[PDB]
Design an enzyme around this catalytic site. Structure first.
Site, short mmCIF file in Angstrom:
data_model
loop_
_atom_site.label_atom_id
_atom_site.label_comp_id
_atom_site.label_asym_id
_atom_site.label_seq_id
_atom_site.Cartn_x
_atom_site.Cartn_y
_atom_site.Cartn_z
N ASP A 116 0.87 -1.16 0.00
CA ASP A 116 0.00 0.00 0.00
C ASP A 116 0.91 1.22 0.00
O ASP A 116 1.87 1.26 0.77
CB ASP A 116 -0.93 -0.01 1.22
CG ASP A 116 -1.74 1.25 1.35
OD1 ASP A 116 -1.23 2.22 1.96
OD2 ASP A 116 -2.89 1.26 0.84
CL LIG Z 1 -3.56 4.58 4.62
#
Ligand SMILES: [Cl-]
Ligand code: NA
Length: 144
Positions: A124
DNA sequence: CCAGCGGCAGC
DNA sequence: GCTGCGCGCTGG
Protein backbone atom coordinates in the site's frame (compact mmCIF):
# COMPACT_ATOMS: atom_id res chain seq x y z
CA UNK A 1 3.04 -0.39 25.92
CA UNK A 2 3.40 -0.46 22.12
CA UNK A 3 3.05 3.07 20.81
CA UNK A 4 3.79 3.42 17.08
CA UNK A 5 5.86 6.54 16.39
CA UNK A 6 4.51 9.62 14.68
CA UNK A 7 5.90 9.97 11.18
CA UNK A 8 6.43 12.75 8.61
CA UNK A 9 3.66 11.16 6.54
CA UNK A 10 0.76 11.73 8.97
CA UNK A 11 -1.05 8.43 8.59
CA UNK A 12 -4.34 8.61 10.51
CA UNK A 13 -3.44 5.14 11.86
CA UNK A 14 -0.82 6.93 13.98
CA UNK A 15 -3.55 8.57 16.07
CA UNK A 16 -6.12 5.73 16.09
CA UNK A 17 -3.78 2.86 17.06
CA UNK A 18 -5.08 2.75 20.64
CA UNK A 19 -8.57 1.58 19.60
CA UNK A 20 -8.29 -1.22 17.04
CA UNK A 21 -11.97 -0.98 16.09
CA UNK A 22 -11.63 2.73 15.25
CA UNK A 23 -8.38 2.10 13.37
CA UNK A 24 -10.07 -0.66 11.35
CA UNK A 25 -13.14 1.49 10.69
CA UNK A 26 -10.76 4.14 9.32
CA UNK A 27 -9.15 1.62 6.96
CA UNK A 28 -12.63 0.77 5.60
CA UNK A 29 -13.31 4.51 5.15
CA UNK A 30 -10.05 4.71 3.11
CA UNK A 31 -11.06 1.90 0.68
CA UNK A 32 -10.66 3.61 -2.73
CA UNK A 33 -11.40 6.96 -1.05
CA UNK A 34 -9.04 9.86 -0.40
CA UNK A 35 -8.29 10.58 3.24
CA UNK A 36 -8.87 14.29 2.63
CA UNK A 37 -12.56 13.48 2.16
CA UNK A 38 -12.94 10.34 4.29
CA UNK A 39 -11.35 11.45 7.56
CA UNK A 40 -13.73 14.40 8.25
CA UNK A 41 -16.68 12.02 7.72
CA UNK A 42 -15.02 9.48 10.03
CA UNK A 43 -15.33 11.88 12.98
CA UNK A 44 -19.04 12.36 12.28
CA UNK A 45 -19.48 8.59 12.14
CA UNK A 46 -17.66 8.02 15.43
CA UNK A 47 -19.70 10.76 17.09
CA UNK A 48 -22.90 8.86 16.17
CA UNK A 49 -21.44 5.35 16.61
CA UNK A 50 -18.70 5.60 19.26
CA UNK A 51 -18.11 1.84 19.59
CA UNK A 52 -18.56 -1.50 17.90
CA UNK A 53 -21.08 -2.28 20.65
CA UNK A 54 -23.51 0.23 19.16
CA UNK A 55 -22.37 0.03 15.52
CA UNK A 56 -23.35 -3.64 15.34
CA UNK A 57 -26.93 -2.59 16.23
CA UNK A 58 -27.11 0.17 13.60
CA UNK A 59 -29.52 0.38 10.68
CA UNK A 60 -27.16 0.27 7.69
CA UNK A 61 -29.32 2.87 5.93
CA UNK A 62 -28.45 5.42 8.63
CA UNK A 63 -24.75 4.64 8.18
CA UNK A 64 -25.05 4.86 4.39
CA UNK A 65 -26.56 8.36 4.67
CA UNK A 66 -23.35 9.49 6.40
CA UNK A 67 -21.15 7.72 3.85
CA UNK A 68 -22.96 9.11 0.77
CA UNK A 69 -20.37 11.76 -0.28
CA UNK A 70 -17.57 9.17 0.00
CA UNK A 71 -19.05 6.75 -2.54
CA UNK A 72 -19.35 2.98 -1.91
CA UNK A 73 -21.93 4.02 0.66
CA UNK A 74 -24.43 1.14 0.72
CA UNK A 75 -21.62 -1.40 0.35
CA UNK A 76 -19.54 -0.02 3.19
CA UNK A 77 -22.53 0.71 5.44
CA UNK A 78 -23.46 -2.97 5.32
CA UNK A 79 -19.79 -3.87 5.75
CA UNK A 80 -19.40 -1.67 8.84
CA UNK A 81 -22.37 -3.24 10.66
CA UNK A 82 -21.29 -6.82 9.93
CA UNK A 83 -17.63 -6.05 10.66
CA UNK A 84 -18.57 -4.53 14.03
CA UNK A 85 -20.68 -7.59 14.85
CA UNK A 86 -17.84 -10.02 14.08
CA UNK A 87 -15.29 -7.79 15.85
CA UNK A 88 -17.20 -8.38 19.10
CA UNK A 89 -18.73 -11.85 18.73
CA UNK A 90 -16.36 -13.87 16.50
CA UNK A 91 -13.09 -15.43 17.67
CA UNK A 92 -10.09 -13.81 15.98
CA UNK A 93 -6.37 -13.23 16.37
CA UNK A 94 -5.93 -10.90 13.39
CA UNK A 95 -8.66 -8.74 11.86
CA UNK A 96 -8.22 -10.17 8.35
CA UNK A 97 -10.44 -12.96 9.75
CA UNK A 98 -13.27 -10.40 9.95
CA UNK A 99 -15.67 -9.35 7.19
CA UNK A 100 -14.54 -6.18 5.44
CA UNK A 101 -10.85 -6.28 6.47
CA UNK A 102 -8.26 -7.54 3.98
CA UNK A 103 -4.49 -7.19 3.62
CA UNK A 104 -4.49 -3.40 3.88
CA UNK A 105 -6.54 -3.25 7.10
CA UNK A 106 -4.68 -6.24 8.51
CA UNK A 107 -1.24 -4.78 7.72
CA UNK A 108 -2.39 -1.54 9.34
CA UNK A 109 -3.40 -3.45 12.48
CA UNK A 110 -0.11 -5.35 12.68
CA UNK A 111 2.00 -2.17 12.29
CA UNK A 112 0.00 0.15 14.56
CA UNK A 113 -2.15 -1.77 17.06
CA UNK A 114 0.37 -4.47 18.00
CA UNK A 115 4.16 -4.50 17.90
CA UNK A 116 4.53 -6.73 14.83
CA UNK A 117 5.68 -4.24 12.17
CA UNK A 118 8.90 -6.16 11.45
CA UNK A 119 6.77 -9.10 10.27
CA UNK A 120 4.60 -7.04 7.89
CA UNK A 121 5.25 -6.69 4.14
CA UNK A 122 2.76 -4.05 3.02
CA UNK A 123 1.58 -3.40 -0.52
CA UNK A 124 0.00 0.00 0.00
CA UNK A 125 1.52 3.33 -1.03
CA UNK A 126 0.98 4.99 2.36
CA UNK A 127 1.80 1.95 4.52
CA UNK A 128 4.99 1.38 2.53
CA UNK A 129 6.19 4.93 3.18
CA UNK A 130 5.59 4.61 6.93
CA UNK A 131 6.98 1.06 7.14
CA UNK A 132 10.12 1.80 5.09
CA UNK A 133 10.74 4.84 7.28
CA UNK A 134 10.30 2.71 10.41
CA UNK A 135 12.85 0.13 9.20
CA UNK A 136 15.27 2.97 8.44
CA UNK A 137 14.87 4.82 11.77
CA UNK A 138 13.72 2.35 14.44
CA UNK A 139 17.05 2.35 16.30
CA UNK A 140 17.07 6.15 16.59
CA UNK A 141 13.46 6.16 17.87
CA UNK A 142 14.37 3.99 20.90
CA UNK A 143 12.74 0.88 19.40
CA UNK A 144 13.75 -2.77 19.24
C1' DC B 1 -14.51 20.19 -19.57
C1' DC B 2 -13.75 15.27 -18.03
C1' DA B 3 -11.03 10.92 -17.37
C1' DG B 4 -8.34 9.03 -13.71
C1' DC B 5 -8.03 8.15 -9.06
C1' DG B 6 -8.28 7.70 -3.74
C1' DG B 7 -10.01 -2.28 -0.97
C1' DC B 8 -12.72 -5.88 -0.34
C1' DA B 9 -15.90 -9.63 -1.11
C1' DG B 10 -18.08 -12.78 -4.03
C1' DC B 11 -18.01 -15.40 -7.99
C1' DG C 1 -8.72 -13.77 -12.14
C1' DC C 2 -12.29 -10.82 -12.56
C1' DT C 3 -15.97 -7.41 -11.49
C1' DG C 4 -19.39 -4.24 -8.80
C1' DC C 5 -19.44 -0.84 -5.78
C1' DG C 6 -19.27 5.14 -6.24
C1' DC C 7 -18.68 9.85 -4.50
C1' DG C 8 -15.75 14.27 -4.95
C1' DC C 9 -11.12 15.74 -5.85
C1' DT C 10 -7.52 16.53 -9.14
C1' DG C 11 -5.30 18.66 -12.90
C1' DG C 12 -4.13 19.19 -17.85
CL1 LIG D 1 -3.56 4.58 4.62
NA1 NA E 1 -11.55 -10.36 6.10
Amino acid sequence: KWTPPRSPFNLVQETLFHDPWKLLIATIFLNRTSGKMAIPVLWKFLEKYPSAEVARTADWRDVSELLKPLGLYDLRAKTIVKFSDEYLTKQWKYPIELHGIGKYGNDSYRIFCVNEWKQVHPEDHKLNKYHDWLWENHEKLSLS
